[PDB]
Write a protein that binds this ligand. Structure first.
Ligand SMILES: [Mg+2]
Ligand SMILES: [Mg+2]
Ligand SMILES: [Zn+2]
Ligand SMILES: [Zn+2]
Lengths: 236, 189
């Protein structure tokens, strides 16, 4: 499909950045046009175009939404299942394995967050040549810098980007430990559960499902919903 | 064995990913490393395969895959475009930027000396005294931005800048940031 320099430069940028929020990619899209001065397609139409010359690479600019507050993000994501590699290439064997171990914990974690300290204990486990906690604390900051990991209060969760990239991989690899939202039915790393079911749903899902409802009731089992209903995302 | 259209398209895709990822590191990339970590058993049809990588690499992302030295057996990525928060720019402007930067960061106001010892480090006295004629406001030797600048830059831009130095900008910003955005909005009207 018809590619322009504006499109390639967009891709170059979108990649050096791991991932971008909606407005930043329109701030982006427009930038590329102004740097290449014509009319600027609805970012949505712009993308679909590109996504379409990408088919033969079996990769796509994918839109996703965050697990903490439902911001729209976009990453360049593989349609190919075994996406262990975008990082596999980026980091050391021992670094990769540290991620695995960390991810492994993020999942089992009720919260979808893991403590730094719980992670670092796994440092002697690491494959691919000895590292120490000091070195390890940096690497964790690396994953944060690169939008695979997110931190709050010395704890770590997967970054939206991570999920967009590796959802496939993850599910296929950790089927008995993965959690899925009702509603979305997609992988879910953090969210609210029901006390009566064990049902779970992404915050933004809980936001939308119970939006404008004075009596939020658990969809499966219909028991009253114990948690604070978030207010669905909007530009402000 | 039997490889369908997609089996192959997948392979070239894999390769263009490999290249893309490496070039960030400005490695440069070794044909053998390429061969170990991507081709595997598809070696027999590689050159044609490479050719494809090369073109897609160029056509979709506008990168020229080039051997750097003839008979290097090693390749690199060259940007065909095009090419390229405050901008062959002046030397001093960087300095200023840093300074107007410092000032934004510690609550929009900062004492003199503290920066100075810390600055030479990285015409000091005289250039920053005259910085005042224009970009600066100084009392006694406390510092504030001074009128000239806000016409020429923003709290956000200064942020983008300080950001780019370490890179990022969520973390040193959030505190400051929020006003910087309250300034972006402030700028509309
Ligand atoms: Mg400089
Ligand atoms: Mg001196
Ligand atoms: Zn969901
Ligand atoms: Zn329930």
């Amino acid at each position: 499909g018809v590619m322009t320099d504006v499109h390639r430069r967009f891709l170059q940028l979108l990649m050096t950045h791991g991932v971008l929020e909606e407005w930043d990619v329109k701030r982006l899209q427009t930038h590329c046009y102004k740097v290449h001065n014509a009319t600027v397609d609805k970012l949505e139409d712009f993308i679909n175009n590109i996504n379409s010359v990408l088919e033969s690479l079996y990769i796509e600019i994918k839109r996703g939404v965050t697990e903490d507050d439902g911001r729209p993000i976009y990453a360049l994501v593989n349609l190919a299942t075994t996406s262990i590699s975008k990082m596999a290439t980026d980091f050391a064997e021992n670094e990769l394995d540290l991620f695995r171990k960390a991810l492994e914990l993020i999942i089992d974690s009720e919260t979808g967050f893991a403590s730094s300290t719980n992670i670092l204990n796994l440092v002697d486990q690491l494959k691919g040549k000895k590292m120490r906690k000091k070195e390890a604390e940096q690497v964790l900051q690396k994953f944060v810098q690169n939008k695979w990991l997110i931190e709050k209060e010395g704890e770590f969760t997967l970054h939206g980007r991570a999920i967009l990239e590796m959802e496939q991989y993850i599910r296929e690899t950790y089927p008995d430990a993965v959690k899925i939202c009702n509603i979305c039915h997609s992988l879910l790393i953090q969210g609210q559960s029901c006390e009566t079911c064990g049902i779970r749903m992404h915050l933004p899902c809980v936001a939308k499902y119970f939006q404008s409802n004075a009596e939020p009731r658990c969809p499966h089992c219909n028991d009253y919903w114990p948690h604070e209903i978030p207010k669905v995302f909007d530009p402000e | 064995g039997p490889r369908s259209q997609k089996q192959l398209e997948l392979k070239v895709s894999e390769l263009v990913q490999f290249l893309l990822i490496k070039d960030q590191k400005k490695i440069p990339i070794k044909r053998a490393d390429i061969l170990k970590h991507v081709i595997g058993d598809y070696k027999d049809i590689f050159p044609d395969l490479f050719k494809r990588a090369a073109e897609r690499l160029q056509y979709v992302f506008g990168y020229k895959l080039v051997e750097l030295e003839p008979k290097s057996n090693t390749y690199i990525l060259i940007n065909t475009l095009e090419p390229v928060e405050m901008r062959q720019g002046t030397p001093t402007t960087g300095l200023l930027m840093i300074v107007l930067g410092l000032i934004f960061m510690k609550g929009n106001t900062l004492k003199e000396t503290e920066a100075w010892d810390f600055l030479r480090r990285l015409p000091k006295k005289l250039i920053t005294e005259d910085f005042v004629r224009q970009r600066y406001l100084e009392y006694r030797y406390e510092f504030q931005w001074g009128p000239r600048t806000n016409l020429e830059l923003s709290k956000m831009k200064v942020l983008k800048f300080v950001a780019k130095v370490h890179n990022q900008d969520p973390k040193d910003w959030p505190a400051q940031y929020c006003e910087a955005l309250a300034d972006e909005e402030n700028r509309a009207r």
